[PDB]
């Protein structure tokens, strides 16, 4: 459905923003790493997550 | 070594685009690492743009 | 966790820090070697108060503990973040070093609250320098401060 397709497009769009926000937070040194993990390892996990939540 | 790399880079890039330097000749300028690498090497795989 | 203390969140954190291996290397920003000739005083004016509390009274005796030590200083600076994060006292760190070299190294330190965390080291009773760089390698690499060997990153789980 066209409406379903709008919902799907805005679902990906919102997850992109969620990522960008986590990107801006990590760029301003506000991000804190989840034990035995790099700050980069921590950011990646949460980015991969938001996008896989979105695909689902 | 070179003292004004930008001037030399524009010169060489214009020379190859004219045909004076063979079009297959690879010429890279890493500004961050302060290096000019030129390859006249046989065997390099290239693509047109 | 112990059958009783199964939901005891505080006992979990306690065992977590009791078993996780912690080396001096993990809590050090930089180590330096200074030529501070008279051991009773200090060239570095930053460290002036370190000698004024630890070195003054006591003494460890009056002075007796052989102050004719060595003119070469090993100055270690510790990261307040990683110190407090891994729950450590300057005294804890200091006593662990003083127990490794027994009576071959006169060790002193800045207190837990001071602006900079410093550990001042000097050898005890011809030819030196090269041996000091060997002592600092043994310090960072070997000396265990807290935890059991082979046990890295310990994590809590519900």
């Amino acid at each position: 459905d066209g409406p379903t397709m709008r919902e799907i497009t805005e679902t990906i769009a919102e997850a992109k923003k969620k990522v960008l926000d986590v990107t801006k937070e990590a760029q301003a040194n506000l991000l804190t790493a989840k034990h035995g993990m790099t700050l980069r390892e921590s950011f990646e996990d949460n980015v991969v997550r938001f996008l896989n939540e979105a695909r689902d | 070594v070179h003292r004004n790399p930008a001037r030399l880079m524009e010169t060489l890039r214009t020379l190859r685009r004219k045909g004076d330097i063979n079009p297959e000749v690879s010429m890279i300028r890493d500004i961050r690492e302060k290096e000019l690498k030129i390859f006249t090497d046989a065997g390099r795989v290239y693509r047109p743009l | 966790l112990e059958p009783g203390h199964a939901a005891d969140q505080e006992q979990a954190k306690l065992i977590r820090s009791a078993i996780e291996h912690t080396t001096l290397k993990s809590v050090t920003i930089a180590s330096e070697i200074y030529y501070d000739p008279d051991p009773r005083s200090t060239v570095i004016p930053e460290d002036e108060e370190i000698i004024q509390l630890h070195f003054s009274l006591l003494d460890e005796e009056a002075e007796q503990s052989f102050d004719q030590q060595s003119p070469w200083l090993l100055r270690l600076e510790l990261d307040r973040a990683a110190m407090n994060d891994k729950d450590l006292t300057m005294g804890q760190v200091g006593e662990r070093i003083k127990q490794t070299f027994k009576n071959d190294l006169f060790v002193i330190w800045s207190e837990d609250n001071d602006e900079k965390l410093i550990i001042r080291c000097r050898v005890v009773r011809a030819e030196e320098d090269h041996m000091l760089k060997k002592i600092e390698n043994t310090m960072l690499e070997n000396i265990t401060l807290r935890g059991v060997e082979n046990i890295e990153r310990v994590v809590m789980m519900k």
Binding site: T32, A33, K34, H35, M37 | - | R16, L53, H54, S56, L57, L58, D59, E61, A62, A81, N84, D85, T89, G91, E111, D112, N113, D114, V154, V155, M156, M157, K158
Partner: protein, 119 residues
């Protein structure tokens, strides 16, 4: 026997801090009163040691360095002279002695590490 000589030197330090720390109490919100008050902690820290039957020397420094501090720890040092338990302050000695500025960072760290190793 040697113990008394080691205790003697320890008291000398407290009175030195009790003369050069007591000045801002009068500046916002003398050498004789500092001597008596120095002895009040030297025998109080001795209560904490050799129970029923080394640690002490280190407790002396943390009491000296923290109570010295200012202009953040002076607000805590003000309470010490003004009816704040001198008995509790002796067996206190840890992150509790620290500056309100340093205790803000210590609490900011501790509660942030907690969410990282809880997985």
């Amino acid at each position: 026997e040697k113990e008394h000589k080691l205790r003697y030197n320890a008291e000398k330090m407290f009175s030195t801090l009790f003369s050069k720390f007591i000045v801002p109490e009068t500046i916002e919100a003398v050498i004789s009163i500092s001597q008596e008050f120095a002895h009040n902690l030297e025998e109080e820290l001795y209560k904490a040691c050799l129970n029923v039957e080394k640690i002490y020397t280190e407790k002396v420094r943390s009491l000296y360095s923290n109570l010295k501090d200012k202009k953040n720890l002076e607000l805590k040092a003000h309470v010490v002279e003004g009816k704040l338990p001198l008995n509790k302050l002796v067996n206190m000695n840890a992150s509790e002695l620290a500056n309100p500025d340093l205790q803000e960072f210590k609490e900011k760290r501790d509660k942030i590490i907690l969410e990282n190793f809880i997985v």
